[PDB]
Amino acid sequence: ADREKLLTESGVYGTFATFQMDHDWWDLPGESRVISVAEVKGLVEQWSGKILVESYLLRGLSDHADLMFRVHARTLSDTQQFLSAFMGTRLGRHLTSGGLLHGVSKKPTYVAGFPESMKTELQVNGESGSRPYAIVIPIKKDAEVWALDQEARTALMQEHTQAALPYLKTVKRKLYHSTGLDDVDFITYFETERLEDFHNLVRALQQVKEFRHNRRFGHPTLLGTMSPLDEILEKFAQ
């Protein structure tokens, strides 16, 4: 019900937590593991009131990463308590943190200066799909960029948006403002059913001016499949 309430509002913190599994985890009986999976499910259900948790399977698509959480919360204190509780489960005890990124969702600052045709088209964001591919790309801008004026940056983002137009429906997008909460300026997140499309999207965006100013682009580039927490957890219990 309130899953759409956090996924759209401004001032909401999004956290991306990556985890890897110790090898001696498979040296455990399938029954100890089945119990450990139930513990995790109960915990997220317990937190289903304060925070929203979506889970992704990174195992086999991203190196040194088996699982990712995307946590939405009004305060990172909530995220901290939940993540700390998660790593405390018997499943969590066997997990190695492989990355942690935070960012807050905001209302667009440049869209207001775009052509109205571009504004209205931007009201489209992805399309209905089951178990889509998900990509997360952390971004650090070089310092020279922040010297530019509001008009110039508005221009760069329109050039940016213009190249991305063909993918409004076929590629869902989300942006998190991350500067000061970690070592990057932005966290970018995308959903898609066709990876060949997303590839062309990033390839198209490489042709604009804005792209020349990335100190960090990827590193890591997280690639996974969006899946119910149930299905992912099952894969760890055989």
Add this chain to the structure above:
Amino acid sequence: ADREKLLTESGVYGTFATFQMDHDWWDLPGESRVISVAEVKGLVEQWSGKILVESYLLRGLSDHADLMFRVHARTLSDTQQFLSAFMGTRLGRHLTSGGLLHGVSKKPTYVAGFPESMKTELQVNGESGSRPYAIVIPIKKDAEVWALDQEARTALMQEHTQAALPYLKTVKRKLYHSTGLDDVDFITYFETERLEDFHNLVRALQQVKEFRHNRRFGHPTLLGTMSPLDEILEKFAQ
């Protein structure tokens, strides 16, 4: 009593030590951990005469980090003695050092050359708050910066303060001069109850001239919650 002499005086060394918990710590009985946690509590109280020790929960906010200490001492040999004992406890035996940074506090070198109105406001530094967020950011400047004359750097630093003024109350700050004691020139430390404020603070500072001259900014950016040592250790002993 003298807890405030260390947090405010000049010539006081601040050391930041971050720790990650080994997985085989969870292979220990809750009985041994409660005993091991008791060991650490006594040690800091034992050292409660010469140095000040503050603990932070980094687990769930920073990757590869569960705990951080901020230790203040008049001589770094004392800090050395304390940490060496801490890492010797059974809790310490299972901890992986994730970084160790030192810096000394000083009297401002540029503030004297600021406008007097700006001087007086700088006398404001944070506000009363309970269990605040804490951010630690190591900073390395590129070499050309040190070539500039004192007047130019005063100008850079004034532009720096000018952008930071709106956050004097909502963001407490402290600076440690670290060059020669490790691989960074400064350690920056901040407390806040509002991360979105601290975020906006760094965004404002990214727009000034001095910012263009950072060889290293972050790496790591430490984010945690300030908490009594008791509560932190508690979380690891169940």
Add this chain to the structure above:
Amino acid sequence: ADREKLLTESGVYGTFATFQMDHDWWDLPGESRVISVAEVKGLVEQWSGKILVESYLLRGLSDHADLMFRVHARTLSDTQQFLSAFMGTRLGRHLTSGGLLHGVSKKPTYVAGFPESMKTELQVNGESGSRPYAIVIPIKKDAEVWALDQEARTALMQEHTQAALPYLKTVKRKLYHSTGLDDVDFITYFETERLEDFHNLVRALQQVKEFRHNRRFGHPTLLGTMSPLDEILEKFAQ
């Protein structure tokens, strides 16, 4: 049967998975290992319907890497499901992931602008050989490159083809377009029976203009021997 249709078609995903073996793997009886190798072979034929899996021996030629897979699939979900199961085997359980790269094969975009003499020559691609050396070289182009026009980029690739012509026969080649699926823009793959030929090819390509615009070239440079799954597995069961 249809294995060359994937190795040649466009819209086919190529994934490169590298593995190192844990030391505690050899503390197992030679009897258990053979059983575990048995576990792996059944899996590849079980997936031999949905995906193509080729295996390479990297042990002794590449540092910190013992095994590599080259998986071709219609969808990366298939690769993920296979790989997630593979690392789940009792053999995989003792394997440390050393890298994962994805890329899609496409029809040439620049060749159409080549001389007819050069185009026809390009239809030659490697030659018949047994258990050839294999090389994988990930590539990231710098951002300034993507600003150039189609004509300029066409010229650079013609000059590129021109220098590589002598190796059409002695060096099999394949290119994967990877941008957005990981931290590189291209994955290049080669088969050859004479490493000094492939060497002369790469020193020759270093002489061209296009070569100066590689932010990342190698890292890692993967060198291994192409072998049936049967022969490689032998080496971990001794």
Add this chain to the structure above:
Amino acid sequence: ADREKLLTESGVYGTFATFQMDHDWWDLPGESRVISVAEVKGLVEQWSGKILVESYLLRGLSDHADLMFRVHARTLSDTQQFLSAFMGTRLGRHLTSGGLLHGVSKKPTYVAGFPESMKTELQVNGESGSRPYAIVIPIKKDAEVWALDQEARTALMQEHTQAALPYLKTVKRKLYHSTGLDDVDFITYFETERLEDFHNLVRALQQVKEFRHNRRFGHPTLLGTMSPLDEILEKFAQ
């Protein structure tokens, strides 16, 4: 007999493999160590037909390295099989691979354009010595260098050779061409009885123009003592 044929011919592959000893090696009885040592001692004798293996003591001179092999072979498949067999022994089982580099020996490409005086002096290469120091320095040249024409590059190498002339006898030298076989362009190898001579040589070579064009110089720089395999392993069985 053919011991000098491999160390002098062109078309010979030189591979450098460094190893470190695990701590759990000492948790074995002194007889278990002697059995593992005899196994390795025996294994090299077995490969003494196809390839030449020279052993170096890096323990105490290079960090995270106790042993280095220098293997010469007409084909790298032999080297792979040998190293893969070595890493399989119970001694090797306790070993951590610390680096692996390949390169081919060639006949000089620039010397032909040198003064007859330089050619004749270059016929000097080292001197008679027992258990000499050995240094390995991997080199990556930057892309601009390969853009240069053959005449200009010949001049750079002459200026290069000229500074090196005083050390022809007291420092043995060998060059391996490595491009495409790994992430570096050259592998350099040296023997000497007086390290301060070799030091002065490297300082002397730092003064020429060509030196400014190394993207990578060292990393790692390997320092060890040339010693029979016999004495090296002996040191591990007490």
Add this chain to the structure above:
Amino acid sequence: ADREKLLTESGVYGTFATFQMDHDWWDLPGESRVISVAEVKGLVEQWSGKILVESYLLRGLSDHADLMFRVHARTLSDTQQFLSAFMGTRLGRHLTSGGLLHGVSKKPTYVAGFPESMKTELQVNGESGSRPYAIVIPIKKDAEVWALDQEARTALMQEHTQAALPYLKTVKRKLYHSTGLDDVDFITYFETERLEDFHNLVRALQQVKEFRHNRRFGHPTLLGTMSPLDEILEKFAQ
């Protein structure tokens, strides 16, 4: 007796060895540990003819480092044997190698071209003190520096010496020429009783031209306390 001859003479090698203590060292009875302490003491006493061994406590001041040796020898092979022998002791069995650097002492090469006041002032080097702080800073110069002539570098080094004059007495200094023996050109070593003094020294040196030409400055900067081997080991025999 000759302890002062080695610490001052030219042609003497200084080696810096870092060690970290294994966790399983504390799982031994305090009595078993004491024998190892006598074992090492006996070992150093045995080498007291050929080499000088000084010990430092890095634990609690340097990250990933508990102990450091500074070994002086007329030949580097002897250092190899002692270190190779030392890491073999039951103390050595529990020690983890953490870094290794070598360098040779020389007669000053630039000082002769200084003003005589600067020459005479330079004969001051530290002061009598017990258990001083010690700092080690590895240095790699960028290639352009070595292109400069003897006169120009003399000018650079004078400017360097000039900024350092205030610290002649309060900071002892020593310089090792390291090129070719590892990945750095120089190893710098300092003793001081006042770290804030050494800090001000490095801040002062950052302002001269020479500082801008460091490819590598620090990484790591080692910080520890000079202490007798006996007292340090006792701390490990508790």
